[PDB]
Symmetry: C3
């Protein structure tokens, strides 16, 4: 039944994604819960805005919650009489309906892959979370004569399945590393800033690869017109017009995307401001660092393995760089906040009728939050500074470092060059909130002029590997600093 599927790219992508998302049933439940998350966010925001009154809740017998909830008829009438909200409601509803249709289609598309796993591979769906991709790939390449997927080419190879899965990720890595994309700017106040978000990456990929009129004809061969040099200026102008149209669309959807981002961030990151307020001072590998430390023909889990093995030294290194003014401010703010909080707590203990005072409880809560977040920037008074033996054990994992880092690891030049590869979680959240605003700007003013050189790139950096199609060249550039398998 798996003879000449003729979409081996998407087939292998799905075969790999079903192994990553452990099990067909677990993937199904994950997508069900993600649909439920969106539905819950939208419904709960609508409820809070319309039904609840906040007049008899803020107190201006005990007041019970069903007192504040208006009856369903008048709440629905108030929803209807809004308009400005009823527009966003239909927009979100049609988006959710489209998502549900896609999920219904993918259900069968992935049940096919489940059957392929069960029969052609003899791998039970209970032994997937305890099997490795090396074994799955070895079985696929061993049984390649029985299930008979690709005998058009002579045989199937691990290099062929790699090229099939990572065909567009190799192109994105080559672009980002050859600096053919507008992701660096000079900001008065900070200077050099690398701005690379999920929205920007999605837009770049949608402009270049996906779509009916993109650079790639079907899914494994870019249109022949892009392999010649005569029509260079035509191709550049066409790409510029496409980029302009997509940037205009991004600007049109800006309020919707911004509202969704704000709501999701407040729902998914505001309980941490009490449960663990120091969790936003930590760091994570930036979306630029992921595309910068990535080899050619390297799977997502193979990259995450290194980015996990090299995380604790990368936190120790970035903690060995004390900020003096920040430490001073933290110490003094903590002292003042704790000195007020101790008096409040002693008064409350001696007599609790002081909790009924108008603002004492909220004051105490906010002062506790303040002292707990200020105590998070004070480094431990006893930590060993060895910033040279830390890079030697980071470079052993991330495999890529600029040449001017091994000699001088203590300078304030490496720390801010490395901070683009290892950014604050709060900076990630911030630059994700600013994305719906500043994504069209980069997609109109900063990407459209470059539209020429990109089309030069795709013309002279594409190899026709037999049995696979058009892939990106690896050994041609080799101008990534270190280089390592």
């Amino acid at each position: 039944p798996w003879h000449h599927i003729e979409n081996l790219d998407l087939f292998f992508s799905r075969v790999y994604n079903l192994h990553q998302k452990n099990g067909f049933t677990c993937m199904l439940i994950g997508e069900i819960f993600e649909l439920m998350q969106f539905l819950f966010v939208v419904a709960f925001t609508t409820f809070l805005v319309s039904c609840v009154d906040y007049d008899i809740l803020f107190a201006n017998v005990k007041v019970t919650l069903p007192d504040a909830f208006l009856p369903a008829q008048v709440c629905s009438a108030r929803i209807q009489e809004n308009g400005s909200l009823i527009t966003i409601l239909v927009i979100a509803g049609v988006f959710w309906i489209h998502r549900l249709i896609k999920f219904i289609y993918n259900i069968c598309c992935y049940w096919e892959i489940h059957s392929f796993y069960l029969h052609a591979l003899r791998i039970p769906m209970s032994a997937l979370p305890y099997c490795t991709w090396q074994e799955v790939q070895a079985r696929i390449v061993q049984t390649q004569k029985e299930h008979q997927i690709c005998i058009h080419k002579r045989e199937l190879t691990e290099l062929d399945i790699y090229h099939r899965i990572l065909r567009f990720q190799n192109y994105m890595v080559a672009l980002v590393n050859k600096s053919l994309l507008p992701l660096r700017f000079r900001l008065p106040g900070l200077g050099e800033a690398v701005f690379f978000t999920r929205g920007l990456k999605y837009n770049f990929e949608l402009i270049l690869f996906w779509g009916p009129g993109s650079l790639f004809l079907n899914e494994w061969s870019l249109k022949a017109e892009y392999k010649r040099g005569g029509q260079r200026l035509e191709l550049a102008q066409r790409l510029s017009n496409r980029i302009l149209w997509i940037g205009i669309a991004n600007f049109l959807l800006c309020p919707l995307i911004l509202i969704w981002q704000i709501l999701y961030a407040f729902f998914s990151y505001a309980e941490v401001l009490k449960r663990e307020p120091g969790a936003l001072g930590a760091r994570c590998w930036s979306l630029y660092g992921r595309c910068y430390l990535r080899h050619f023909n390297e799977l997502e889990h193979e990259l995450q393995s290194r980015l996990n093995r090299g995380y604790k030294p990368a936190s120790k290194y970035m903690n060995c760089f004390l900020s003096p003014l920040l430490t001073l401010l933290a110490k003094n703010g903590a002292f003042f906040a704790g000195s007020i909080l101790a008096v409040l707590i002693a008064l409350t203990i001696y007599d609790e009728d002081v909790l009924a005072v108008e603002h004492v409880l909220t004051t105490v809560t906010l002062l506790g939050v303040t002292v707990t977040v200020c105590r998070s920037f004070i480094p431990d008074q006893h930590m060993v500074f060895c910033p040279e033996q830390l890079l030697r054990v980071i470079l052993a994992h991330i495999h890529y470092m600029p040449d001017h880092w091994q000699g001088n690891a203590h300078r304030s030049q490496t720390r801010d060059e490395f901070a683009q590869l290892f950014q604050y979680k709060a900076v990630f959240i911030l630059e994700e909130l600013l994305s719906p605003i500043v994504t069209p700007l980069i997609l109109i003013f900063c990407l459209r002029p470059r539209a020429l050189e990109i089309i030069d790139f795709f013309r002279n950096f594409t190899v026709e590997v037999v049995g696979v199609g058009d892939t990106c060249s690896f050994a041609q550039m080799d101008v990534r600093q270190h280089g390592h398998p």
Copy 2:
């Protein structure tokens, strides 16, 4: 004064236990506090049930606590008029009185050992917590001509004191490792389950060793009738009748034991559900793992040393096994709980009169507990998976591993075989609560049929070591998987 004590087993057991429980005064205070714990639990439960009224406490001038407490006369009358409670009260009172009598007797029994330490050993009672059992045993064997405990045999030896202390623990280890005890079952829903609790072990030991009519005549020689083969069926039938009677007694005491277990668990494990709600997700060496990883002639602290040195790798290993469905459920439950909790907290901060609403405070508390327990099952996003180099450093400590573990450490066959040696703290608590119920069942239906083979064992697996008595054979079986000193 220590000439021919004639109970060297119990004497050496006490000499070792006084070294373990550091100091005579510390052991005395420990037993005083354990008596006080039992008294407090019983008295506090009786108080909460009888005196307090909960009508004028639940509010249906400020209400003060002495308002709820009924006067002593009417509370005592209400205690008296119960009956169903006054029976449990006399039962608990006579149990506590018996315990106090035993403690009074042991006071003098251990002051004798304190004097033996002070005089015959020249070890002050202030240098015990800083002395090792190797030194204590060396001193005992060196001064064995002055204090003159055992010159009936030619000399005293460390092997002799080992055999004297661990005479019954060697038998229990041999039984559990030769599978002559009913501790494994097939449960529809889980499959193979190892059920071994303190109640079961105590009952096994009370059936076999302790008692007037048990297998052992005095304390170091089993009755001669058990060394012959003629009366095999008589001995088996007698053992079966004894097991039946003791299992019937266990079933008769079931409600008392169950009530005590419930009360003690609620008193000693319910503050952790707020103080550290993730502490029940941790793991501990099961009572089966203790008897499985135990050598022959190995003291309790010598076993605990290994079980402590091999605890961190044994936690890392069992954490390297992700549960996909559990992680999905945890992530989604945490998202929903935190999204509701953030709205509640923001409302409370903006205006605190919303805390007077009927259910807001208990809602907030339960939602915080929910999000904090759900966040405990989400593994850290950055952890290295190396499940082969972890068994190599566990086996170096626990010294015992089945043969079919070194080859395949990532399978879902080893993880659930190892989870019988390293169980959840919550599973320990659960199977301890079910013990008063399901202990007689195993003691009537599952142990009574085996009563034949046990008596075969004791007949052909007992060695008469001169100067010590009847001990268990070590080199006869040697069918524990790895083997190591």
Copy 3:
């Protein structure tokens, strides 16, 4: 402009202190904030004592905070009518004014050093927090012909700048290590106790070095009269009179210093009793251990580097010493506290009207604090005891250990000898609170009799190093136990 400054001691001290306190602006802001801390403490205590009434706050419409605050006119009248408070107010005001004058003077004194850094060294004030003292000292010694600070001697050397910076710290180390200072006592109840506080060290230094009539003439040469032996008894009697006068002054200022210490400790250590109540069970290197493990000619950061590298093993070692009675008391107190707290929490959850009871909330808070501080003394049930391989890795860092420590590290003789070098944070706080009381006593009865031998020391333990002046002898004594570079 830096030709023959003629106060090279203070000049180099300031050059080093500006490198340590990272940057001129950061040092300025630190001193501003320390002045503000003192002002805030004093003003807030005065406010709490005078303005607030606590009658309409303790409740004997909602009560708002501006209701409790008396109007400024009557609060100022109440401040004026006190007297006993208005005296302390003028004392604190003149102290703060003197501190502000000193700060104004030091502003210019350190702007001079900032200019010296910028011009004579070519080290920008933005590259200081990322430069090392080795590089700063190398630059100072390299450019020593251009800026022309000291060509009176032949050349400048790193040994010369070391001797210039640490001239008095070497003397203090020699005294403390030769036991010419009264810092050890026999206390009935504890026995040998080492009492060394910041007040005692400041008084010792003010008696010996600083001042107009101290032992040192200007700043690098002790008066010639102290280099002869004829006037020994005169010099001893003069030193005794000076010590007596300074001890009398210390006793006169005792209530002021004690009030300040109490207020500062309550303001800076009472929020930790809720934020992290186990933080006072930790340990820190005592002020005696600092002067005991210190080499000759070793800077403060060079000492702190070792005391930081040898902190985790020094905590593991002092945790490998179990206190049996303390562990028993902790376990039992935690059990009882948690058993009461669980009942209170279950009642609150089932019905929240029980929070309005007169003492339930403060009871719950104090019981939570009790159980959380008791749970802090219970050691982790799984920790490896290897107290011999810990001293081998501590001595590698602290470089100094008595001879009778390597053989027997498990005894209860080393643990209490090492506990004078590594003390509880709470013991530090306590012995700092008792300092204003017991500092004059040691300065009248215990230091005044020794005044003879000290003057012997300074007479026969001073070397005239050319180009530097009078320094302390190093190789003369060499009776510190281990010895290491």
